[PDB]
């Protein structure tokens, strides 16, 4: 096997990754206090899981993973929580002072006092792997520390680990769960910085995420705790074939080649089906061919947009529980004659399909009912480029008028990195425009 | 109190939904640039659908269906017909049509060529259905309006765009006997006012010289066409579940052969309305599309036919 | 509809299904990482040096 | 980022200022000698932000008491939480300022100042991560006006990194002690536009037709107008003061409310208005908070356009009905909510009510509407500065007409920046 190291920088990138690391020890029936009594091997092992999990002599099962926030007080919930021994202390780093929603202050001003302990902690993972394949990155594109910090780590990432691949888990911003008024600069400025550094990058509208909280698990006001654990069921759905027995999917490198023909179009559209409430009395089990065809329905997308007004460079069907080829085979028969699935014509007009047996584990106590079958699509459609639009448009509103530009400036960033990152940006809607239409 | 924005000043038809919405005090405007609306009234080119149905607590709805410009240009209409196997190659109400990017009589368009030497290059239809007395050209003009949940509401009201001229087979240079348009012909308005012959004359003139109804002879071609067309594009259209939803007004423009056979020739995503119906069809566009999604404190005709088979 | 490279195993299987055929260097970063600080630092200074000629007008005005 | 150090100085500085320690310490179950006696956990989770761990586990203030004069301070300490206050704290002079910027800010409170500035590296020094400081004062006096800003200055020189927060009374004719008010405000303007992060423009006139017009209350005194400060600055405060999920510093704060740095004053607002049996609904509040009639800061919003907002809820209510109150507003006012900043009005809920309301409603704006409250005073100022009248008490503590020609040129600039984001 081939190890991958999970990065967490920012709130949102460490609470995701608090509600996905439960989830795997789930999965693999690893415990809080690190034993798994399923596996047999102690000490060691070239299992699937062990590419997520290092071992130790006395029998515990560590993440490789990496916790890092410019502020105490998040990473301190998992010093203190359920899951406490499961991590080293090394692995959970913090500073005093946050970047203040600053991306400026994230990657200048505090990034470089903190960039050189991190790369060492992370050496320190790396060290412990006989062939190392490579990050997973989760951050927000709202946050100071999420978009500046993980942009300077992505720039050094490469430096140090050139042979490596990395992915991205990226939370884009959403103004019904957002303070954070200055989010369009953010996310604009460490998309620039991160997109030759980034292999393939699935993004996150916290509004969808959102959405579905409301309208499929009838959660009246949905909490982070609400959206990270639908995130993580995502989130475990593309990884599962990194931490499984599998032909499809088995390193990062398979994730690129198989998703992003286009190196710098490398965001793929993640959609989920099916998100069922636990609370729910009666539940009548969705066939194949339905959360199939829940793949195609932009409600149960991680962004919101309309994937028939644009064209697919790749589809990739990842399904969880009691499936088999056929049935797969028929639903997509079906589905074909009926939507509009347009592909560019380059691309082959298929699907690369993936069925793991294990139905998809729910947290106990948690939203989401235990299901027979679930499915993640992973396509890479031309329709997310809806989100650059929607993102680009809030940034030349703001910065037409100039408007907080002196808060990143005030920490020694310049003002033409602002138009510098527009530009790409404006290059970026145009490549995806092109391929599209 | 609901909000709405208007992106097309040119737009004769939205210029007035834009008047009738005020006039209730109900309905505020805003700037052009606001994101805090209910409805938008927008562009014709590069309407930014990807901003649409993303502002929290607002439900916002559309005069316009993305991907409806797939009806609308003649070069994606006539690719339409042919790969579509709901329309398929052998249409018996489309004319026989091809494509060449830049009883034998053709038409080119997008400058219009009618010649047999030489965009489109479409059968031109030789023996129409010419109106007495004058011996003279038409086509009809129809409206149908697509709300939200994707009901066909067709217009009861249409037009005949007459032709002034005498109609010549051998002279095909001579413009205004083959071409029916209303700004070409501006004889203009010595058998109708405007070369606008509306639909009670038309029925009469039916009964009168051949016998027949509109209704019977024309409209139920028209009917089963306009159904035909929009049902087959409902799947890549349609906003249901969507989080943003689109209404808007066509214009199918149609020709009638001398054995009565109506033939489609161009379906109009941004039509303009005849002088006389604007304050009805206008207000049928506020109470259908608009007031139905916005609730405040008939002259369609639905098109629905599920026969089994 | 071709349905190829099948492969199984006892957690899963897996196969593709075909309808129809068709970076900068550690000198540059830690440079301008640096080159933010000099602005910053310079942004500093130029804030004591007109806080030094405000305490240098209160003296005149004692004075 | 955690400790925030407090300073008070002048009459009404120290008035409001005793005031906050009086309504917070009961919020937090801290009672007059220091002690401990509440029952949640929540009163003691952030209560480093404010006070500081003495022996025998109480809780003293990291608030600093500065006058020139002992009068009000020795009012504060025979007041009710007097006792609760570090006696070194207490740094005051004896002949006084006279309502005299120049007094406070260039010769008596020069002499005083150094000594002021050792307790704040005092209580600086043994900070964990101290995330700001916040000043209680008046800009119409001597003492808070021109000792106050003098203060700032000097903060802002050892302190530069730190974020300086303002609670600055503004003077008006209806509750007025001297005429040369507009003249020691507008000097303070001047001051506060360079060294502040924000300042909440807590106008006097505004509380004054508060208490008389919306509260029935004849006669005011200066308690009825600082029941209203009170309650505001604990408003303010709240965020900070407990969680709820809510991760913010000042900067974060700072940062998302100021888009301009010059442009960062701010008109508070309360609801309800207080001198009750039935609570108020969610839709009442979210009316209230945004009514003229309720703002602290005698503008009227409707002549300006808000560039951010910050609404903070009090009590135990539905969040669903918040975000369709709070969005109810903005959609149906849109023309007010300036377009170029997306998404600009932004809202919490704390559980915890205060002492008295079952729920409650505090407003902070950033409107360029406070125009309105710069050109009041730069009109009074005028009347006076025209004939260069009262100027002899300025130019007799070593002054300049040049000073005062600055002041006024500064702060017809201050409204003319507002002013072109208006129209914008
Ligand atoms: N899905 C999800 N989004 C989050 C979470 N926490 C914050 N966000 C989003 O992330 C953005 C704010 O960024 P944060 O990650 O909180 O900021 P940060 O990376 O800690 O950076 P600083 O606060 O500037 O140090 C907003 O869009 C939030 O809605 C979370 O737990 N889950
Ligand atoms: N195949 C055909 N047979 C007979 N007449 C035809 C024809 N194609 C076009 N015409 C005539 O040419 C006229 C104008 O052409 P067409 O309708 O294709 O373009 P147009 O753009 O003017 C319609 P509109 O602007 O109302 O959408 C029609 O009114 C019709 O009478
Ligand atoms: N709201 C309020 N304003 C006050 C109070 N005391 C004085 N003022 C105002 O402050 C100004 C006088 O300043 P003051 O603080 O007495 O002078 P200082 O002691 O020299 O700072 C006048 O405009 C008064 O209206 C008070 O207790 N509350
Ligand atoms: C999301 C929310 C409502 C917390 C918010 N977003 C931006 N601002 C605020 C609130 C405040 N913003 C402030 O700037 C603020 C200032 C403050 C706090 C303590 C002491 C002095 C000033 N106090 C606040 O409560
Ligand atoms: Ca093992
Ligand atoms: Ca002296
Ligand atoms: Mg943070
Ligand atoms: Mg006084």
Redo the contacts between chains.
């Keep these: 096997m081939r190890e991958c190291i999970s990065i967490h920088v920012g709130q949102a990138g460490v609470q995701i990754g608090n509600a996905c690391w439960e989830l795997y020890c789930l999965e693999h029936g690893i415990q809080p206090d690190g034993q798994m009594p399923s596996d047999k091997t102690i000490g060691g092992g070239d299992d699937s899981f062990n590419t997520f999990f290092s071992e130790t002599g006395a029998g515990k099962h560590v993440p490789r993973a990496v916790f890092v926030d410019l502020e105490p007080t998040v990473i301190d919930e998992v010093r203190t929580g359920t899951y406490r021994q499961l991590f080293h202390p090394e692995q959970l780093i913090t500073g005093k002072e946050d970047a203040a929603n600053n991306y400026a202050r994230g990657h200048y001003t505090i990034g470089k006092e903190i960039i050189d302990l991190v790369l060492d902690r992370i050496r320190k993972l790396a060290d412990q792997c006989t062939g190392l394949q490579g990050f997973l990155v989760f951050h927000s594109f709202g946050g100071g520390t999420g978009s500046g910090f993980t942009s300077l780590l992505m720039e050094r990432l490469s430096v140090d680990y050139g042979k490596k691949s990395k992915l991205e888990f990226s939370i884009y911003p959403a103004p019904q769960v957002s303070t954070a008024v200055v989010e369009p600069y953010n996310s604009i400025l460490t998309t620039h910085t991160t997109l030759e550094h980034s292999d393939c990058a699935f993004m996150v509208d916290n509004e969808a995420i959102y959405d579905i909280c409301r309208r499929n698990l009838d959660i009246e006001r949905p909490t982070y705790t609400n959206l990270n654990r639908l995130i993580s069921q995502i989130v475990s759905s593309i990884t599962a074939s990194l931490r499984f027995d599998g032909a499809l999917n088995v390193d990062l490198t398979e994730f690129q080649t198989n998703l992003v023909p286009y190196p710098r179009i490398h965001f793929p559209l993640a959609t989920y089906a099916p998100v069922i409430s636990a609370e729910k009395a009666y539940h009548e089990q969705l066939s194949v061919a339905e959360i199939t065809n829940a793949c195609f329905e932009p409600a149960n997308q991680m962004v919101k947009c309309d994937p028939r007004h644009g064209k697919y460079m790749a589809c990739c069907l990842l399904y969880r529980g009691d499936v088999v080829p056929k049935d797969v085979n028929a639903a997509i028969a079906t589905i074909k004659t009926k939507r509009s699935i347009q592909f560019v014509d380059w691309c082959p007009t298929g699907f690369k399909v993936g069925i793991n047996y294990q139905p998809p584990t729910v947290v106990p106590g948690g939203d989401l009912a235990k299901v027979q079958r679930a499915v993640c699509m992973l396509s890479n459609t031309t329709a997310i480029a809806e989100a650059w639009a929607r993102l680009d448009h809030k940034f030349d509103l703001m910065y037409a008028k100039r408007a907080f530009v002196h808060w990143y400036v005030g920490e020694g960033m310049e003002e033409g990195e602002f138009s510098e990152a527009r530009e790409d940006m404006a290059a970026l809607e145009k490549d995806y425009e092109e391929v599209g239409v | ?1 609901y ?1 709405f924005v208007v992106r097309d000043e040119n737009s004769s038809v939205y210029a007035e939904v834009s008047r009738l919405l005020l006039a209730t005090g109900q309905w505020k405007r ?2 052009k ?4 609306f209910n409805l938008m009234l927008g562009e014709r080119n590069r309407l ?4 649409l ?2 502002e ?3 439900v916002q709805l559309v005069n316009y269906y ?2 409806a410009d797939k009806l609308c240009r003649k070069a994606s209409l006539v690719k339409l017909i042919k790969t579509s196997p709901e329309l398929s190659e052998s249409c018996t109400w489309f004319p026989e049509s091809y494509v060449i990017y830049p009883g034998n009589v053709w038409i080119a368009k997008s400058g219009i060529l009618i010649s047999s030497e030489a965009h489109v290059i479409q059968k031109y239809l030789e023996k129409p259905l010419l109106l007495e007395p004058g011996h003279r050209k038409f086509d009809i003009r129809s409206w149908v309006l697509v709300d939200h949940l994707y009901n066909i509401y067709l217009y009861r009201e249409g037009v005949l765009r007459t032709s002034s001229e005498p109609y010549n087979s051998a002279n095909f240079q001579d413009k205004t006997c083959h071409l029916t348009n209303h700004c070409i012909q501006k004889n203009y308005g010595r058998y109708e006012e405007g070369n606008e012959m509306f639909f009670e004359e038309f029925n009469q003139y039916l009964m009168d010289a051949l016998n027949t109804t509109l209704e019977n002879s024309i409209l139920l071609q028209i009917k089963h066409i306009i159904r035909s067309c929009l049902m087959c594009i409902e ?3 349609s906003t249901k ?3 943003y939803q689109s209404f808007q007004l066509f214009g199918f423009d149609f020709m009638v052969d001398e054995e009565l056979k109506v033939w489609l020739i161009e379906v109009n995503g941004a039509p303009a309305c005849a002088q006389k119906l604007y304050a009805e069809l206008c207000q049928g566009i506020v109470d259908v599309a608009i007031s139905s999604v916005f609730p405040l404190a008939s002259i369609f005709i639905k098109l629905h036919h599920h026969h089994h088979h | 509809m071709e349905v190829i490279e099948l492969n199984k195993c006892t957690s899963g299987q897996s196969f593709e299904v075909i309808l129809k055929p068709p970076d900068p260097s550690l000198e540059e970063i830690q440079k301008k990482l640096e080159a933010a600080e000099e602005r910053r630092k310079y942004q500093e200074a130029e804030l004591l040096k007109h806080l030094a000629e405000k305490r240098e007008h209160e003296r005149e005005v004692i004075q | 980022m955690r400790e925030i150090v407090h300073i008070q100085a002048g009459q009404c500085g120290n008035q409001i200022g005793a005031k906050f320690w009086e309504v917070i310490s009961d919020e937090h179950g801290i009672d007059p000698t220091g002690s401990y006696h509440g029952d949640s956990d929540l009163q003691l989770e952030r209560i480093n932000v404010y006070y500081n761990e003495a022996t025998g586990n109480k809780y003293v203030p990291r608030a600093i008491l500065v006058d020139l004069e002992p009068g009000t301070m020795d009012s504060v300490r025979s007041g009710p939480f007097g006792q609760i206050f570090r006696p070194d704290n207490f740094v005051f002079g004896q002949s006084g300022a006279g309502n005299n910027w120049a007094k406070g800010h260039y010769t008596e409170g020069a002499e005083l100042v150094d000594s002021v500035l050792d307790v704040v590296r005092k209580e600086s020094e043994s900070c964990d991560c101290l995330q700001g400081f916040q000043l209680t004062h008046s800009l119409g006096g001597g003492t808070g006006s021109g000792m106050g800003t003098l203060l700032i200055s000097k903060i802002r020189e050892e302190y530069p990194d730190r974020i300086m927060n303002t609670f600055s009374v503004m003077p008006s004719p209806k509750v007025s002690d001297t005429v040369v008010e507009p003249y020691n405000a507008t000097l303070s303007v001047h001051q506060l536009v360079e060294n502040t992060d924000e300042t909440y423009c807590i106008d006097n006139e505004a509380l004054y037709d508060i208490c008389f017009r919306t509260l029935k209350l004849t006669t005011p005194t200066y308690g009825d107008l600082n029941h209203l400060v009170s309650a505001t600055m604990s408003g303010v405060t709240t965020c900070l003061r407990f969680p709820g999920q809510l991760n913010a510093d000042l900067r974060k704060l700072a940062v998302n409310m100021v888009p301009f740095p010059r442009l960062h004053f701010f008109m508070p607002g309360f609801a309800p208005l207080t001198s009750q049996y039935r609570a108020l609904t969610v839709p009442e509040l979210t009316q209230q908070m945004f009514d003229s009639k309720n703002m602290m800061a005698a503008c009227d919003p409707r002549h300006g356009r808000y560039l951010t907002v910050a609404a903070i809820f009090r009590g135990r209510m539905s969040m669903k009905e918040v975000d369709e109150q709070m969005l109810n507003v903005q959609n149906k006012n849109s023309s007010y909510f300036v377009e170029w900043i997306p998404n600009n009005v932004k809202t919490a809920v704390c559980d915890i009510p205060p002492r008295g309301l079952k729920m409650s409603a505090t407003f902070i704006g950033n409107s360029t509407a406070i125009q309105e409250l710069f050109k009041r005073i730069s009109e009074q100022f005028t009347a006076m500065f025209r004939r260069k009248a009262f100027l002899h008490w300025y130019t007799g503590e070593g002054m300049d007409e040049m000073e005062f020609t600055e002041a006024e040129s500064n702060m017809n600039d201050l409204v003319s920046e507002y002013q072109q984001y208006q129209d914008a």
């Design positions: 109190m909000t805003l700037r640039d606001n994101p805090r930014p659908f990807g901003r149905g993303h929290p607590g607002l993305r991907g799947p890549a259209i579940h969507l989080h």
